[PDB]
């Protein structure tokens, strides 16, 4: 009776549809109270029905009355009563924390933090579990409004729990402390503060420190390590290092695992200053000014600290210093051995010479021990019995070979000669390569996965080295393993092949002679690109796990550009192919579906893409099985999204409109029309994306019923898809309106099963609660359907939609509240239509040199208003960002068309909310102010042609003069200001000079240089005197900026816009070469740092190209001769004292 009571009360809430009413608010509040009261009984079924009706009323009431719900939730969170009810209300408030407006954020924070400390003090276990789940989402939603002392007292409250005996409360305090300081206000200052506190807890280690607290502080440090990337200094990190090097030899079975976990995750993703002090020769000396022998601590000279680290770790845990013997499992645990091997593996990966060091610095006790051993029996642990040790040594030998072949520049013989002269170990890399081969054929799955990760770390460093033969042997020994009894082994095999460029593999095949035999004297070719592409990846699309099919599609996308099919009309040999690959790196508004550009296009990418689509489509057509059709539709949707069919149109062509191409639309348009394919959505939405792309890619050839299409043989296809799409959307309408059943699916007996599946998945969505989800079937399906309808509707016309606009708008009147991001874009695109709208001398020298010389030769020279009002209210109530951007683009396109502004016929509260957003942008409160602000400014400047432009300039100056980094906020704010003021009387001139002075303030950034290109291109057309004066001003501003290295031209696109500026600059401005040589012959303050050298040389290149192009030779020789430019400017001694200094 109580279960039926809570259920019929939930029904009485959800059946209201009478919102924004005070008695409705009171019954809603008391209903929320009794709902959380239904979840307090000590029984399973009543708690479950309470949980589901509470999640139902939360998610169904999330649209209209949001903050009353969270107000009641906070009012029950403040009670601190039963553990179950507090757990439930707290995790639901954490999941609803990111739906608040930023206006009411600070009262919720100042009301929430004492109860946060109260639940932090709670000793219930699952309360600590939901606390660890709840804190990071809250402080991601609420962090950037808190002052420093509030975060400090929060951190002190969480640090006060680090002495407990339970591991759950320790993990909660650790993860919550790191999660608060990650988001807080100034993350570097809080990192330095927390390192200070957590090392103040471990002031000198020659004391008792309550070893549970040691495990807790090491877990905090393990969480704190990946985030370090006033600043935290290097002495703090070397104190962390000496801490975790002391705490490896403590007598406990848990503190050694915590210490090795910290050390391993420190060596994996290291902080860079600690990295430079660790790889240094003397190292820690410059920072201060089972063991039976002298290892030598990490403060002596002439030996890197990683050498002592590897020596101490290996001599302490996994080796006996008398004989090449395994240490038993009796004294040391085996997960200790696995963690120690991963630690020493990453320590080899940073500095490989440590693996060749003698483990004992002094020869130890020659009477009892005849020989000494090095750290070379570390690779004797493949023969260890336990799995996850042999794979640890597999990963060790893999990263060892990769760190040798990338530490030294592939000069293996000289490097091994230096080491063999220094240290006495006889060791080559073909003594662990057969061991890494032997591990790949082992029985258990975990050692196979670890050996496959070893090949992933190892193989493309191997095959481009002098040991490429063993690299081919490793590729084949991996290739035999596509059919083991695990999904992780399969996805790891298939992720090793997506990091092999087969141009180098084909070169090594053609160069090899007797490796085509291999074992057992085979005869014939060894077609690795065919035995990999056609046999492993397209075949492993036919697995049953969607994990393996999805990662197979990802590996196809990565394997397209590196295939090298034989005898293309571009790259012919393999050596021309690899030379092309390395030369192109080192040496040099319609929807998303279409384009109208001529689009000059690569050739071998067209051949590889046509080959791969021929193979995938051949497997899609003749698929005898079931899962292969989903696995190929995923891969074809992904090959259309990565490689566009409007850009790579000659790749997808299969002669259907032969002579911009349709491609394989017909097979897909059959595949949707069946009755077994739309039963699952996880490939049905992908097939809708592919059908939309393959019908949209034939636009600009075809266009010049559906009279704009122009090609009659294409007409019904679109019709079918278009009709099918409307049917699908009608189904989704009848999901969100609980109504049992042109676009109509009443008589069609296949769509009723679809409606059943959608209703079941929507019930599974309404029962559980998880908001920020990417893999959402029904929402993702509505997104893909509306996306493809938007893409198709650009080909429509008023004769095509003029009898069907009202039912599409009626369908969009319902499905708005589910996913309004890609739902309003359908309204935008529908409103668009309703108003009319090769021989290695060519590749390595000659073609780039003629590009360069041609560059220098050129360088010498009316029903929409309910949905509209609903969208405006949805924008004023939301916090999701892409929704805001899309509503602003809808308003931009609506104001571009000459409509009256009767949408705010009474008030202007919309622009008041816009300026209130400007305020929280300017102080820095807003979480995702980046991708919303240029659309706000574009909307404002589009409004201004009837609010005056100086208000926009004042808001821009308020953003600029007091705010955060300009490359996200300030520059894209100024961009539509510039683009819609220069390109499109005296007051305009004053705004022009104010805007260009604001541009002059920000010259250090290169998008500002793109803006300045637009400036000079517009003013050179108008008047040449103002052009010349402005070029003189920008030249004598910009040249001492280049001289003192204060320009950020580190990017190549930055240097490109700098060179196009010096092309577009007036020649009369650079006509005296005194400033062009005073800013040329400069020396930086310190060229020890890399980016200083890069900015210096990029400035020198940027002026040297002008010295080559714009002026001649005798002029700059006379200009040097009149000045005193000494040739000893950068002597070898000068660079020596600069790299020292």
């Amino acid at each position: 009776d109580r279960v039926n009571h809570c259920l019929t009360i939930c029904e009485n809430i959800v059946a209201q549809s009478v919102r924004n009413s005070p008695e409705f608010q009171k019954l809603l509040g008391i209903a929320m109270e009794l709902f959380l009261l239904c979840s307090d009984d000590a029984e399973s079924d009543v708690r479950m029905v309470a949980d589901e009706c509470l999640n139902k009323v939360i998610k169904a009431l999330m649209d209209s009355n949001l903050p009353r719900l969270q107000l009641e939730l906070y009012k029950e969170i403040k009670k601190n009563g039963a553990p179950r009810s507090l757990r439930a209300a707290l995790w639901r408030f954490a999941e609803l924390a990111h739906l608040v407006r930023p206006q009411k954020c600070r009262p919720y924070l100042v009301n929430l933090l004492p109860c946060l400390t109260r639940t932090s003090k709670r000793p219930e276990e699952s309360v600590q579990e939901t606390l660890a789940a709840a804190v990071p989402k809250i402080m991601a939603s609420f962090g950037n409004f808190a002052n420093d002392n509030e975060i400090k007292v929060l951190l002190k409250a969480f640090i006060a729990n680090l002495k407990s005996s339970s591991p759950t409360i320790r993990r909660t305090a650790a993860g919550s402390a790191v999660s608060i300081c990650q988001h807080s206000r100034r993350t570097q200052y809080f990192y330095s503060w927390l390192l200070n506190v957590l090392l103040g807890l471990l002031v000198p280690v020659e004391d008792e420190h309550s070893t549970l607290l040691i495990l807790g502080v090491l877990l905090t440090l393990r969480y704190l390590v990946p985030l370090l990337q006033v600043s935290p200094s290097a002495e703090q990190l070397v104190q962390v290092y000496e801490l975790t090097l002391h705490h490896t030899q403590h007598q406990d079975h848990n503190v050694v695992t915590g210490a090795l976990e910290l050390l391993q995750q420190l060596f994996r993703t290291p902080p860079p200053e600690l990295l430079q002090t660790l790889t240094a020769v003397g190292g820690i000396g410059q920072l201060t000014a089972r063991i039976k022998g002298d290892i030598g601590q990490s403060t002596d000279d002439d030996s890197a600290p990683l050498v002592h680290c590897v020596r101490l770790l290996s001599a302490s845990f996994l080796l006996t210093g008398g004989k090449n013997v395994l240490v038993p499992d009796r004294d040391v645990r085996v997960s200790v051995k696995a963690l120690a091997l991963s630690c020493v593996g990453a320590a080899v990966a940073l500095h490989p010479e440590s693996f060749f060091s003698k483990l004992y610095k002094v020869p130890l006790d020659t009477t009892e021990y005849p020989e000494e051993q090095y750290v070379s029996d570390i690779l004797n642990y493949i023969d260890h019995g336990d799995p996850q040790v042999r794979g640890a040594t597999a990963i060790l030998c893999g990263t060892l070979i990769c760190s040798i072949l990338s530490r030294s520049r592939f000069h293996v013989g000289d490097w091994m000669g230096t080491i063999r002269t220094l240290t006495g170990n006889t060791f080559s890399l073909a003594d662990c390569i057969p061991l890494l081969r032997k591990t790949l054929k082992d029985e258990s799955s975990v050692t196979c996965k670890l050996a496959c990760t070893a090949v992933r770390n190892c193989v493309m460093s191997l095959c481009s080295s002098s040991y490429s033969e063993l690299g081919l042997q490793l590729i084949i020994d991996v290739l035999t393993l596509r059919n083991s009894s695990y999904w992780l082994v399969r996805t790891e095999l298939l992720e090793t092949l997506a990091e092999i460029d087969f141009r180098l593999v084909s070169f090594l095949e053609a160069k090899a002679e007797n490796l085509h035999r291999g074992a057992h004297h085979y005869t014939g070719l060894l077609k690795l690109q065919e035995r990999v592409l056609n046999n492993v990846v397209i075949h492993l699309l036919g697995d049953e796990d969607p994990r393996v099919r999805h990662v197979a599609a990802a590996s196809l996308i990565r394997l397209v550009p590196k295939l090298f099919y034989k005898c293309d009309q571009g790259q012919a040999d393999p050596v021309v192919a690899v030379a092309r690959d390395q030369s192109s790196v080192y040496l040099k508004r319609i929807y998303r579906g279409y384009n109208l550009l001529p689009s000059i296009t690569d050739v071998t990418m067209e051949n590889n893409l046509s080959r791969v689509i021929a193979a995938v489509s051949h497997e899609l057509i003749t698929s005898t099985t079931r899962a292969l059709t989903f696995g190929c539709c995923e891969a074809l949707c992904l090959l259309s999204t990565a490689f566009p069919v409007c850009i790579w149109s000659l790749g997808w062509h299969c002669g259907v409109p032969p002579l911009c191409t349709v491609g394989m639309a017909t097979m897909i348009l059959t595949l949707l029309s069946s009755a077994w394919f739309p039963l699952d959505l996880s490939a049905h939405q992908d097939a809708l994306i592919l059908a939309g792309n393959l019908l949209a890619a034939s636009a600009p050839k075809s266009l010049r019923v559906w009279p704009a299409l122009g090609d009659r043989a294409l007409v019904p296809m679109v019709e079918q898809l278009f009709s099918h799409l409307l049917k699908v959307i009608n189904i989704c309408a009848h999901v969100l309106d609980d109504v049992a059943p042109l676009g109509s699916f009443y008589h069609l007996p296949s769509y009723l099963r679809l409606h059943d599946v959608l209703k079941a998945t929507h019930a599974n969505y309404k029962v559980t609660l998880d908001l920020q989800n990417s893999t959402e079937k029904f929402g993702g399906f509505l997104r893909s359907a509306l996306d493809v309808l938007s893409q198709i509707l650009e080909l429509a016309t008023l004769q095509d939609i003029g009898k069907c606009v009202e039912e599409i708008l009626g369908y969009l009147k319902s499905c708005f509240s589910r996913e309004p991001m890609m739902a309003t874009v359908c309204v935008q695109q529908l409103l668009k239509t309703l108003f009319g709208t090769p021989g290695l001398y060519h590749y390595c020298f000659m073609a780039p040199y003629t590009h360069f010389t041609q560059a220098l030769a050129d360088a010498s020279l009316r029903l929409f208003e309910p949905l509209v009002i609903k969208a405006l209210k949805q924008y004023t109530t939301t916090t999701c960002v892409q929704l805001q951007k899309q509503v602003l683009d809808l308003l931009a396109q609506l104001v571009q068309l000459r409509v009256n502004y009767c949408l705010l016929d009474s008030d202007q509260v919309f622009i008041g909310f816009v300026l209130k957003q400007f305020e929280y942008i300017e102080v820095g409160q807003f979480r995702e102010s980046e991708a919303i602000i240029p659309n706000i400014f574009f909307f404002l400047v589009l409004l201004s042609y009837e609010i005056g432009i100086p208000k926009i300039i004042q808001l821009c100056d308020g953003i600029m003069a007091s705010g955060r980094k300009a490359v996200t906020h300030a520059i894209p704010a100024l961009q539509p200001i510039v683009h819609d003021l220069f390109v499109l009387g005296k007051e305009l001139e004053t705004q022009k000079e104010v805007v260009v002075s604001m541009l002059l303030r920000l010259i250090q950034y290169h998008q500002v240089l793109e803006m300045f290109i637009l400036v000079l291109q517009q003013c050179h057309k108008e008047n040449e005197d103002k052009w010349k004066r402005l070029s003189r001003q920008i030249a004598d501003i910009i040249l001492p900026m280049l001289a003192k290295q204060q320009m950020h031209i580190d990017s190549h696109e930055a240097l490109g816009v700098l060179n196009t500026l010096f092309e577009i600059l007036a020649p009369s401005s650079l006509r005296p070469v005194d400033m062009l040589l005073r800013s040329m012959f400069v020396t930086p303050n310190t060229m020890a740092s890399v980016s200083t050298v890069q900015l210096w040389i990029s400035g020198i290149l940027a002026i040297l190209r002008v010295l080559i192009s714009q002026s001649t030779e005798d002029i700059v020789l006379s200009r040097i001769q009149e000045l005193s430019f000494s040739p000893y400017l950068i002597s070898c001694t000068v660079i020596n004292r600069l790299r020292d200094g």
Partner: protein, 268 residues
């Protein structure tokens, strides 16, 4: 009335699949398809017919692939042939050719998989006739597998006809563009070997064969070795071919090596 009977027969078919007998489960799938033909459905009757055909070809695979038995004589081959004929006829009444072509491709693969190549080549050429306007890459792949069938059943002049039809189609749709280059490479090697195998008179010699034998009287080593092989065969020089095959073995696939061995036999 009839939907509950269709769901009952489907449940019976799933139960018999779990029991794994499979003539009777496909017979209940024919009952499903007939009950859905009693109403006006379209594709679901085709789905029931195709699943019955999948079960029949699975049972004959279990009776000749997994069990190469001397007593089996192909009863569910005939049953799957009748059911899939009804399925492709329902598709042709509906108007969707690509699905029916996929069904005939499945028939052709299951028929080639038993050691009976002639009807496999016939149904492959039917499935490639059913894909001529729509998907010419599918037509070329069906014709290539048809050529391998007719080369298995030793209708060499049929393989010559289907190879010159493949080169005609890929030239007409190939500007080569992509995989059409792979088609041209395989067809140009096998049409040369299939012209040296059966040496035609100049009366029946189509002008396309005159073009290829004018070109001969694609990778470089293969073009050079095959051009030398045309010269060594029109010379009729034995030791030339005996040393040419040992160099030409890895550059060709299996069936092209079968054609080249047939060339070497019919000059010796």
């Amino acid at each position: 009335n009839v939907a509950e009977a269709g769901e009952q027969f489907g449940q019976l078919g799933r139960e018999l699949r779990a029991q794994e007998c499979l003539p009777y489960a496909a017979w209940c799938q024919l009952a499903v398809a007939r009950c859905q033909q009693a109403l006006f459905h379209g594709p679901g009757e085709a789905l029931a017919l195709t699943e019955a055909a999948r079960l029949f070809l699975r049972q004959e695979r279990d009776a000749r692939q997994r069990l190469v038995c001397p007593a089996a004589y192909g009863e569910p081959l005939q049953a799957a042939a009748s059911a899939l004929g009804a399925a492709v006829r329902l598709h042709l009444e509906l108007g969707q050719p690509a699905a029916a072509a996929a069904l005939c491709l499945e028939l052709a693969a299951a028929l080639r998989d038993l050691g009976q190549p002639a009807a496999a080549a016939g149904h492959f050429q039917r499935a490639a006739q059913l894909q001529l306007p729509q998907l010419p890459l599918a037509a070329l792949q069906a014709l290539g597998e048809a050529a391998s069938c007719q080369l298995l059943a030793r209708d060499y002049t049929g393989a010559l006809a289907v190879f010159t039809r493949m080169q005609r189609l890929a030239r007409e749709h190939g500007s080569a563009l992509g995989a059409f280059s792979d088609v041209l490479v395989r067809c140009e090697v096998s049409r040369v070997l299939l012209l040296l195998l059966l040496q035609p008179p100049p009366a029946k010699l189509l002008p396309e064969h005159a073009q290829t034998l004018e070109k001969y009287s694609l990778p470089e080593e293969l073009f050079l070795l095959l051009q030398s092989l045309v010269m060594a065969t029109h010379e009729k020089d034995t030791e030339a071919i005996k040393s040419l095959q040992v160099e030409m073995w890895p550059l060709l696939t299996a069936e092209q090596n079968h054609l080249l061995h047939l060339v070497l036999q019919e000059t010796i």
